[PDB]
Every structure is written in structure tokens, then in C-alpha cells.
Design a protein around this ligand. Structure first.
Ligand SMILES: CC(C)c1onc(-c2c(Cl)cccc2Cl)c1COc1ccc(/C=C/c2cccc(C(=O)O)c2)c(Cl)c1
Ligand SMILES: CC1=C(/C=C/C(C)=C/C=C\C(C)=C/C(=O)O)C(C)(C)CCC1
Lengths: 210, 219, 8, 11
């Protein structure tokens, strides 16, 4: 393979509740860039394209990471700073609806299929190599890199989990739900910026302009 | 190898896409108003087509009488985008484009829309692939307002299995053609999210989406 | 209003 | 438009 899954996994290994969540997002935005640089072939792309891919995917990439990290906890989410947020804090803050979708469409499904870190890292790399991002200099080579992750992930799943054929599909069919959840989170965040509700720190603010 | 029930189950499905129907006298029916009315009439009719396609999917009619309705509201947009992509990529269609351009669609929704149509028409889909992918879209368990999710999930499963074997058999040369279709599912979600707005930011002739569309998409 | 009128 | 992100991608 040209997109080995070992260097994907190595990237994973290497790295008010709305206020706390936003704070953790800002923190993880710095570490997200470091993750992406470690993904085979991403750092090779033109800078402008690197910028485009991360601005398009950041919200989904981060939601995927904390969702996986939160398999262990009972009705709730482990933030990167170490604080938990639980369904009750979530609902008492006016964001229960979206918090519930995260728990049910992401955390629970990751837990009930027992996604591992290689699988997470690959899914995140697919999200990163989104060839439909507006303004890419060369859509074709991002498509080509996605296709390499798809091929490497499929051969990881046949090899490691040969008891289940509908498992490559099962993993990929978390991505549409991640996109709908991600769009709803962005909606909220533009709305949190708009009224000044919550303090949005520097890097997170940058991801929310145009 | 080909599936346990094989072609039999896919041929039962494809006769709903045989019932895929558009008889006309070259559609007798030029202006942004007129173009809008034509598109509305096509959308309403494709709603009817889609409702028929749904009842014949394995296990559909059995499952819960309310959550039944929910899937159609949640998926109809995506099915209509897929269908439009199919329509738009043909020579026999070409001036379908002119109607969508001059229909008062707020300018932002143009370019992404025609870009998605292009990504679809680079994937060399085939009826079976359109039919199956549409069925997969409809039986998505992760839509708003549902209690019987696990049950939806089980009806969906064997469709993925059939689709995977079909994309090896038909398109072995692009091996990941199977997974690439799934990545169009992801991208359909961006259109489903924006649609309530697109409709709302739609410049018309002081009218409204014909009663069925007003219901399926509310207000 | 046409909700249940399409399953019949 | 994206100063932090440009700088961090320098490496
Ligand atoms: C309410 C109305 C103003 C409207 O608001 N959004 C869209 C909208 C959607 Cl919902 C999605 C993508 C883009 C767009 Cl603008 C619309 C028109 O939507 C259409 C338009 C045309 C078709 C053609 C189907 C066809 C043609 C020939 C043959 C056949 C056939 O039966 O095979 C089927 C379909 Cl399905 C849906
Ligand atoms: C989920 C969620 C939201 C999304 C914010 C995002 C996208 C944060 C991502 C990363 C975090 C929180 C930490 C980490 O990865 O450790 C908002 C605030 C809109 C509403 C409540 C639920």
C-alpha cells in the first residue's frame, strides 16, 4: 500500500458545558493540524489545499475523535481537557437535541461495533481527503488519496475482522450521520458567535469566519 | 461470488425502477415563473414515483406505521437529487439545466448542485446502482424522529451486500467504486440540511409548493 | 394531511 | 484569511 494504516494509526496514538466544549475544541484544533501533517501524503499537497481540507473537515474530525474517546463513559462525553459533559448538563444548556444525536449516532455505534483506533484514524483520513471541498487546486489527487485510504481500510478489515463482511460498509455508513451532526454543530456555533453567548477562543473563531 | 438469493431479489427491485415512468407528448408545457411551475410538477410527480418505489422494499410495510412516514420525509430530498443526477447525465435532459438556472434559486445553491451532478456522472452508475443506492438512502436509520432504528438497520444490511458484489462484477477496474457511492451518501446530507433554506430563499410568483411538497417539507 | 393516504 | 492555520502548517 502507499497509504499504510500504520502511519495513520501512529497519528492517532501521537495525539457552562458549551463554554467547556468550545475550549476543548480550540485546544484540539492545534493538535488536529499536527495530526493531519502526520497523515501520509497530506503534507505533500499545496498549502492552499491543506488549508481548504482542514477548514472543511475540522468539525467532523474533532467530533469523531471525542466520540471515540467517550465510549467508556455513561451517557456523556469526555472532553480533551479531561472534563466530562453529561446528557443532563447538555439539556440544561439548550443543546440537548444535538448532544443526543452524538451519543446515539456516534458514541453508541462506535461502542457497539467496537471501532478501534486504526479504524477511527482511517475514517478521519477519509474525512480529511474530501475531494468535494470547494476551491481545491487539484480535486483529482485528493480523490486519489481518499481512494488509497478506502483501499487500505478495506484490507485492514478483511484481515483483522474476517468474521463480518458488512463491516467495511458499516464503518463508512457513520460518515453521513457525522456530516449531518457536523452541520448542526456549525449552525449552533455561528449562532453562539452571533449573539456573543459564549467565549470563542482564537483558533476556533478563525475556523468560523469565511 | 453472486449472492444467496442472487439476481432474484434485485430483479424484483428493478421492476419498481421499470415502473419508473414519464409518458408524455414531449411535455407540451420559457420564463422563471413557468420554469418554477414545471419543476414543481416534476418534483410532485417524482414524490409519487418514490412513494411507490418504497412500499415494495423488503420489510418496509411491516415496520412501524408512524416511523414509516418519517423515512420518506427525511429521504425524499436525497432521492430527488439522485434522480436529477441521473436525468442530467444523458443525451437520449440538457435543457433541464436551463430550468433550474432560471427558476429563482438563490445563487449559492447553483454551483454546488451542478458540481454534485458532475461527481455523480463520473461514477458510471447503471440502473441497478441507481435503484439500490436510492433504496439505501430511503432506508437510512439516522433520520429525525424514529424509535425503531435497529429494525431499519436490518432491512438495509443485505442491500449493502448486494451492492458490494454488484460493484465488483460491473466495475472491477475501479475497485473502490463500491465505497465511492457511499461517499456520495455523505455528500447528499449537505443538500438535505440546506433544503429548508433553499426553499425558503426561493424567488417565485407569490405562490407556494403544491400541498404535498408543503407537507413533506413542512410550512 | 396526505400522510396515511399514501400507504393505502 | 486564516493566519493561525497557515502558520501551524509551516512545518
Ligand atoms: C419544489 C421544487 C421547486 C424543487 O425544489 N427543490 C428541488 C430540487 C430537488 Cl428536490 C433536488 C435537486 C434539485 C432541485 Cl432544484 C425542486 C425540483 O426537483 C426535481 C426536479 C426534477 C426532477 C426530475 C425527475 C425526472 C425527469 C424525467 C424522468 C424521470 C423518471 O421518472 O425517471 C424523473 C426531480 Cl426527481 C426533482
Ligand atoms: C458537540 C457539540 C458541539 C460541537 C462543537 C465541536 C465541533 C467541538 C469539538 C471538539 C471537542 C469538544 C473536544 C475534543 O475533541 O476533545 C456544540 C458546541 C456546537 C453544541 C454541543 C454539542
Amino acid at each position: 500500500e502507499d497509504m499504510p494504516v500504520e502511519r495513520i494509526l501512529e497519528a492517532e496514538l501521537a495525539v457552562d458545558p458549551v463554554t467547556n466544549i468550545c475550549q476543548a475544541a480550540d485546544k484540539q484544533l492545534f493538535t488536529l493540524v499536527e495530526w493531519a501533517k502526520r497523515i501520509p501524503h497530506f503534507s505533500e499537497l499545496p498549502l492552499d489545499d491543506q488549508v481548504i481540507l482542514l477548514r472543511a473537515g475540522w468539525n467532523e474530525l474533532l467530533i469523531a475523535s471525542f466520540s471515540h474517546r467517550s465510549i467508556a463513559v455513561k451517557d456523556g462525553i469526555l472532553l480533551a481537557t479531561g472534563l466530562h459533559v453529561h446528557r443532563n448538563s447538555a439539556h440544561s444548556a439548550g443543546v440537548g437535541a444535538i448532544f443526543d444525536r452524538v451519543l446515539t449516532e456516534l458514541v453508541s455505534k462506535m461502542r457497539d461495533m467496537q471501532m478501534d483506533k486504526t479504524e477511527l484514524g482511517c475514517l478521519r483520513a477519509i474525512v480529511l481527503f474530501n475531494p468535494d471541498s470547494k476551491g481545491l487546486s487539484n480535486p483529482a489527487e485528493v480523490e486519489a488519496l481518499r481512494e488509497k485510504v478506502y483501499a487500505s481500510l478495506e484490507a485492514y478489515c478483511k484481515h483483522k475482522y474476517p468474521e463480518q463482511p458488512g463491516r467495511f460498509a458499516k464503518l463508512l455508513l457513520r460518515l453521513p450521520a457525522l456530516r449531518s451532526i457536523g452541520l448542526k454543530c456549525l449552525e449552533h456555533l455561528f449562532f453562539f458567535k452571533l449573539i456573543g453567548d459564549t467565549p470563542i477562543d482564537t483558533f476556533l473563531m478563525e475556523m468560523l469566519e469565511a | 461470488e453472486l449472492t444467496p438469493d442472487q439476481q432474484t431479489l434485485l430483479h424484483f427491485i428493478m421492476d419498481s425502477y421499470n415502473k419508473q415512468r414519464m409518458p408524455q407528448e414531449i411535455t407540451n408545457k420559457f420564463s422563471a415563473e413557468e420554469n418554477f411551475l414545471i419543476l414543481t410538477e416534476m418534483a410532485t410527480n417524482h414524490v409519487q414515483v418514490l412513494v411507490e418505489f418504497t412500499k415494495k422494499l423488503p420489510g418496509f410495510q411491516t415496520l412501524d406505521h408512524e416511523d414509516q412516514i418519517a423515512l420518506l420525509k427525511g429521504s425524499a430530498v436525497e432521492a430527488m437529487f439522485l434522480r436529477s443526477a441521473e436525468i442530467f447525465n444523458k443525451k437520449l435532459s440538457d435543457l433541464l439545466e436551463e430550468r433550474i438556472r432560471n427558476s429563482g434559486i438563490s445563487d449559492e445553491y447553483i454551483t454546488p448542485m451542478f458540481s454534485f451532478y458532475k461527481s455523480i456522472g463520473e461514477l458510471k452508475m447503471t440502473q441497478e446502482e441507481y435503484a439500490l443506492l436510492t433504496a439505501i438512502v430511503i432506508l437510512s436509520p439516522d433520520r429525525q424522529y424514529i424509535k425503531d432504528r435497529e429494525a431499519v438497520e436490518k432491512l438495509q444490511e443485505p442491500l449493502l451486500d448486494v451492492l458490494q458484489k454488484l460493484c465488483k462484477i460491473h466495475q472491477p477496474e475501479n475497485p473502490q467504486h463500491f465505497a465511492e457511492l457511499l461517499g456520495r451518501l455523505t455528500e447528499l446530507r449537505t443538500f438535505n440540511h440546506h433544503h429548508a433554506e433553499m426553499l425558503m430563499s426561493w424567488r417565485v410568483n407569490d405562490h407556494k409548493f403544491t400541498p404535498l411538497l408543503e407537507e413533506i417539507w413542512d410550512v | 394531511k396526505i400522510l396515511h393516504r399514501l400507504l393505502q
